[model samples]
Target: ARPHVVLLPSAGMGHLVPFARLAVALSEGHGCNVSVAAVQPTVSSAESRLLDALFVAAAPAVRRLDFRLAPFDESEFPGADPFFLRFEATRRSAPLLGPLLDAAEASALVTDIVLASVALPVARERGVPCYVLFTSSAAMLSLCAYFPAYLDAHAAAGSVGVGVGNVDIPGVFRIPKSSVPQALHDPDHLFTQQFVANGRCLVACDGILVNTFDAFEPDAVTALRQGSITVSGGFPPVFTVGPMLPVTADYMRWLSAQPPRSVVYVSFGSRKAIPRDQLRELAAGLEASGKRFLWVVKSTIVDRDDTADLGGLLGDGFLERVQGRAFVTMGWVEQEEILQHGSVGLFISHCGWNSLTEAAAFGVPVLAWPRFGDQRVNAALVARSGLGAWEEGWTWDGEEGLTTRKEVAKKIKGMMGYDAVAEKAAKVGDAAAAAIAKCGTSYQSLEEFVQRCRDAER
Candidate 1:
């Protein structure tokens, strides 16, 4: 039987998409069959078809990827917060993971954060080496590696998770508590303790896979590798297997005709919601900027109702006014395609890591408006890194609504406002591409990770 690698990517198309890529890479490049156990308690309409498509797209010619959407007890995920719901489903899927692993005779069980509460423990108990794959930034990886320490330093127990104003982790950007994802606050009563524990779980793994290029966050990645930041006994080595997203830059042909750097693209992320006011302001802000734009402002996520119609949401004549210049899509536009367009000038983003990586991959400068949680730190990093910035009046505080059409318009108009930012973005984008090439940093990390898996078998 082939040595199989099973990956458990918790709910959401965003998480699934990248992990699927990792699986394909392992199977096709590393001489192993890859299986992805995506635990879905219930697949929503938005997520329904996307996951299947991703598996097909990611798998190689031999089709070594055995995609399994494992069933979970829906009752466990009886909550609104998607992250919490997914985590609950991960916990609930514990019964099935081991048997599934045995059936596949898996060599290693690769998983992300949500599954750590269950999969990591199960893998250890069953003598299967487990590797934690973090699908976001290296800085976030740094946080996870040292989370136990942070908890020890700042949080004495249940006291800290309730409301944190600011956090200072050694090598990462200081996080404003407001910037914390609201799900961290709820989604369940034990979020604070649970997520911190999630960190501890990852620190106990065979390796921690981060989808980040080296040049992007050098100091943070280095800190993680050197073991300088964590309070844990011994964390695994950092593997920078990133830009894992296969940037399908040519998905939309309309983008080709536009002038270089003349358009702006807006998207918050797969799960995050932009408030109605914020969405309206963003729409008007685009129209107001007068820059040709492509805004993915469908289904204002403000209320968390994916069923909410953004079809008529934009104001009277807002569409008519921006009709020719702006294309506000309710239908999903593959983001990398739009961002890669030469005519695309600015990226007004909520600073999701996937989007940021693609943006940097293309050398496109960003104007970050962080939505919540990890994004807050990412936004601060963007603003501080010289790859992006915010409008004059606003910052991604994660508290106040970024609901000002005027300020947004002002920021968008001054699109290439910071020459240094553009230069830095372009340079980092260049370096990122190099680092992910055949012998690049991420490529080597991926190679190293695969070899570790190989070594585990011996």
Candidate 2:
């Protein structure tokens, strides 16, 4: 009998999309019975729309599992940060997992890394072996495992990354203190505490599945298996089951009209529209580059407001000046489909793990302009992997204040013109495809996971 696996993804489409895709992939590729259980009352309209799209896409093969939680009491957790609020809310909702597992007749549970703390206990109670789906790069996973010990070692310094100039995780690349996410540098921050706790929780789970390929992150993957980074004596099994997206060989019609490897595709991702000053600089940079480009602009930096006048933000005549050469639009597009298109040569992205992996999978070189959260880590990974390029000063504006248009244009031109980088990116893309092929490393890892689940019952 096929192993019945239920996936519990945390809040946000970033977490939910992968879990949903993984559910569909498992059901279709591994002959496993898969179901997805997402948190109700999505954080944003984008999430709700994406969730609907996922359910429609995953139909027939992957079953949908539902659970409801009581209204979250905001007054009880006054002054709690957003990360704390979402995580705390999920923790309270975790008890619902038990009944859902029973209903699905789940033999195993696969949960997002953030939700591991809550789901593990329930899985343990039900005798269901639990696994974690790490939605980010292996480098971030290594950083998570290294953080607690790194903090403990620096206890007397009394602050995370105070005297330590850089973080070195065995085989992984060394990251300077400035490059680390701001939230992580404060050890006492609620998000940092929860992240460390979840990293610690990994050892208790049956296995940890990362969305990366071996060739893409050899040192990080090797370091994980070597047991050099974790504080829990030894980590549970680590599986590189990723580039968890489909690759399309076809071309983009309007994008195809442009010359091959000439158009630069720009997007800051679903969240965090770059601040106005930076947004202007970005447009100026694109205009100065004099290259064919397509930018999917989000109007507001904080939340969704479709009505916001995005054109005015770019300054007068910005659109008309670049008229024939550039195409700027509001809201969503099919990212995966666009990335794989032949005419698309480069991706100007926020370096979200999903965007980074998808860019790598499609063989498009990325120009990283990371904004917040795990993006910096992923940007670093992108540079180290030869998949793209990132300059330290090219991060979010508040950090160092705005990155100029000239700088952005120069970098875009440099990457777009670099044949060797594009070639290397293409090779990584080929490797990404190979990793998921029938006998590919990722394919074998999935087979091993399925076999492990099958054996759990015996």
Candidate 3:
């Protein structure tokens, strides 16, 4: 009999899109029975409709499941709040979820990092296996799990970047304070609080699944495995099944038309909203750089009111100036296809885990401009790992002050021309493919994880 997997994600588009893709891969690629148990209360009707359409298009073979929690605004958590909104959401939705969990046979729960609080306890209560799926790199996950060591050290010294100081992990030379994402360091930051909560949640789960290839960060992966072993003694399993991208025929055609390594592919993940003023600056910078490019400017990136005339943040004349040289627009484009295109050279991205993995898979170097959350941390990893160059002068404007457009352009040019960036990206791409190959580390781990799910049922 096929194993049944229940997949859930947090409320945001970033979390849900990846969870959906993984569900499709398991059901269609691996021949597993999959059900998506989405538990976000804030998901709107329009969003649900769009998701349903994407699901039908991507994985008609699998069943779609939906669950709702008590109404609560996520913003209420306040800055750096330590509470688990998902746990509370799950508690409120327990009456609804309990029946479903009890009925499904040979069940395994797969969830995004944010949903761990709910997913873990529910899996435990039902005597099933729960797997924590990280949307970031294993390196970032390792940092989260080991944050306490750094935090403990920081409390005594009143300094930043202590715990990760000079520590060496596989695939990386050294861990510096700069390597740790900025959000993780802030004492009262909400993301930091959630990171801690999720770390505790992972300890109780059956396994951890990261969206990265083991070959890319072997040392961090090893540390994670070793740490899990130390905590559980038996070593709860870990899998890195990633480089998720949908490559279609239309995407191929578009890619073939672009000049070789001449186009810059731009995307800001799903959750990052580029403010109106910043969007204008970026448009100006792209035009000023005078490079061929294809940019994915999502409608949600800026306020509708702010985009009155252009249907984008740019002013009316902005499109006219950049007309044939650059594609400044909105809506989703085939990212993987664009990245793999021979013409595409550099990726201007927010360093989302999935985007990072995709860039690595395609050997596209990046000009990193991380906006919030763990993005800064991911950007630092990219720069330090030689995969890309961090956008210059891109600092936290909200608190740390702003970075100008000239600075952003300088960084982009640096990354686009750097031989080391290209070489490292190429190496990472090859390494990623090998890890997910039939007999590779990620592939084997995924196989073992599926078997463990079966055993849990027994």
Candidate 4:
């Protein structure tokens, strides 16, 4: 009998997108029968709405795990307490998840890092092995694993700071204090406390699977295995199977027609909300740059009023101004295909992990302007690693802020330069391929991890 694998992801597109790809890979590549358990809330948030449409479109070959629960309300909590509450809520949902697992036989469990504590215990109670799927950069995971220690060391040294202070951590690229995730810097932050606690759960799982490659962070990957700081399981074995988006034919066709290294692919992942003013600025910047570009703007980024006025703003003459020069827009585009297109020279992105991996996979440079969450960290990685440059800060007059159109054009031009932009793109693209090729470390590790699941079932 084929082994049954159940997957539960934190309710977001970032979590769902990777899990969906993994499910397909497992079924097609490893011969496992998979089912995805998802939660449904009464009032669908913007992200949820987008995910609903996307998942329905994919119609993955798995069970849809939905249960009634309170919508995750961050405003209800004080400081970082909300982060704890969200995890606690997910943990509490385990009882509801138990019967769903109970119905399956010869099962193994796979879940997001955030839900590992909850899902792993349920699997164990059922006498099944549970594997944790980390959906961020392995570098981030490694940093998270040592967060508690870093905090302790900082406290012992009596370092008085807020937000990310400069530290020399091996493997991760050096970054400014502002680049660190806010959760990490605020000691009283709930999410930071929960994230640190969650790192300890790495031990309780059968293994850890990260969506990154060994080449990107070789030293950090090695240190994680050495049990350097918190000894969990002598470097809990890791699998770095990544660059996981399905490459579709249509997406490729769209790219083939574009000019070589000329278009700019834009996406903010699913969770990022681009404000109206910023959207206008982005539109103006692209228009002024005079470069041929393709922008994938989501509906969520614009308000109803903005949408209503878009037609007049993008008037009849506007098409002529941008004809054969720019593709400015909203809605989903085949991102991987667009990135791989010869015409796609650069990306303007929110630095979502999957987007970062895809950009790297295609060897396309990026213009990083992170909006929220771990995006700032990713933006820093892009800049420090030489894959792209950061957007220049906008200047503010007393009454009105001004981001000169010339500045936008200058930065975009800088990113297109052959020496800096193209070289970094080639390096990252090679790293991405090596991570997934047969006999490569990531490929081998993933195969071994899958075999463990089979053996555990047997």
TM-score of 1: 0.88
Global fold similarity of model 2 (TM-score): 0.92
Which one wins by lDDT: 1 or 2?
2
lDDT string for model 2 (82-192, tens) is 435776688778888888777777778998898887889999988789999998889999888787777677676544454334788766778777767777766666667
TM-score for each prediction?
0.88, 0.92, 0.83, 0.81
Q: Rank the candidates by TM-score, best first.
A: 2, 1, 3, 4
lDDT of 1: 0.69
Error (Å) of candidate 2 at residue 302 is 6.3
The digit string of per-residue lDDT tens for model 1 on 1-458 reads: 34567887766655666776677678766787777675443344445455566557755422333334445455643544656555564566576677777776667888877567677878976778898888777777676556556545655655654444455667556665665555455424545556676787765678788888777788888878877676443568889887765522332555676788877888887776666767777787788787888777657332235555555677758877876676776666667667766787788888888788788778888988876667866776677666688543354434564668888888777765546767877886787788878979998998888777776662
In model 4, which runs have C-alpha deviations exceeding 4 angstroms?
Answer: 41-63, 66-75, 78-89, 153-164, 167-176, 187-190, 229-234, 247-257, 298-324, 384-386, 390-404
- Give the range of the ten consecutive residues with the poorest summed lDDT in model 1: 61-70
Runs off by more than 4 Å, candidate 2: 75-84, 157-165, 247-253, 301-303
Point out where model 1 deviates above 4 Å: 1-3, 40-42, 58-79, 154-161, 182-193, 247-253, 300-311, 391-398, 417-419
Candidate whose TM-score is highest: 2
Q: Comparing 1 and 3 by lDDT, which wins? A: 1
The total of clashing pairs for model 1 equals: 6
Stretches off by above 4 angstroms in model 3 are 40-50, 57-61, 73-95, 148-190, 228-235, 247-256, 298-312, 391-393, 397-399, 418-420
lDDT of candidate 4 over 208-256, digit per residue (tens): 7787777766665676666663543354776777766452454355556
Model 4 Cα displacement at 3 (Å)?
2.4
Clashes in predicted model 2: 0
